[PDB]
């Protein structure tokens, strides 16, 4: 197993961890702010997924400073992970294309 592939799998496991920790900490950060909606865990994990993939419908989002900081970590972890996979697919294609030559 090549490095690019390992970094990818590793990025995916880390993403799943950031999603679960993100869901937990967003609820922790948001309860206490009047009007906040990101306050029960099942919808926070869903919020965490749509943030990490950058879709951002939104239907829910953080209103406090710490929930937002948590949002930024989720965003960056998702963008980095999906980017790592893209780059791993590139390394794979470039390697196999040099063999077809």
């Amino acid at each position, epitope marked *: 197993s090549a490095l690019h592939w390992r970094a990818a799998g590793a990025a995916t496991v880390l993403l799943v961890i950031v999603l679960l920790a993100g869901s*937990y900490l967003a*609820v*922790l950060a*948001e*309860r*206490g*702010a*009047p*009007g*906040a*909606q990101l*306050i*029960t*865990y*099942p919808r926070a994990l869903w919020w965490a997924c749509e943030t990490a993939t950058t879709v951002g419908y939104x239907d829910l989002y953080p209103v406090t400073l710490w929930g937002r900081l948590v949002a930024v970590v989720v965003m960056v972890a998702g963008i980095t992970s999906f980017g790592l996979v893209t780059a791993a697919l590139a390394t794979w294609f470039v390697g196999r294309e040099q063999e077809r030559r």
Partner: antibody
Amino acid sequence: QVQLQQPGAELVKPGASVKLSCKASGYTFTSDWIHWVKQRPGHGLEWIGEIIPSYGRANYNEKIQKKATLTADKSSSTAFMQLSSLTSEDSAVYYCARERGDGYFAVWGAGTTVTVSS
Amino acid sequence: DILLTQSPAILSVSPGERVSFSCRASQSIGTDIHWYQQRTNGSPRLLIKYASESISGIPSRFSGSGSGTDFTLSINSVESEDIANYYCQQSNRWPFTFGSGTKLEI
């Protein structure tokens, strides 16, 4: 078995303070919150505050005057509510309730009847 | 904070009849409404969660409906054991809040 155990009563003199307890059993998770609800005789349910034991953070009802301070004890699985500088207005049944972080109160304590009298 | 209005405060019905308690939220809360029963001297008891979901251990006679700002708790063929106070509670926005309560009378 009873999931939340609370003392049946507490007598407190005006100006004094008391600390109510809520001992929990059954399944316990990192996502549990313990809530406290106040009910005066003949009246409705009034939310006081909440605490997430696994982390120790508490939030309180801003619409009312703060008489409560919540704390939890991980080892003894007990949540505590310290009421301070009480008056007759503070006499009521205080229930603790458990929420699995999904918004509803699955189970309630039997409640502690508090009386503020000389 | 979300204000939950329960009206009427007292509801009188005849045995076996169908009854409906109403809960109106001051703003839209999807289906994040929960219903509780509290008999004289008893502690509250969860009856319906998320507006219409059944709870194990609760007679099938009980059902909930609504979404948005208007919610209903219904009882098919009311009986004596149903005499109590009924409360709705919302979990859509912080802080959680309760409705003022409806008393069932037979």
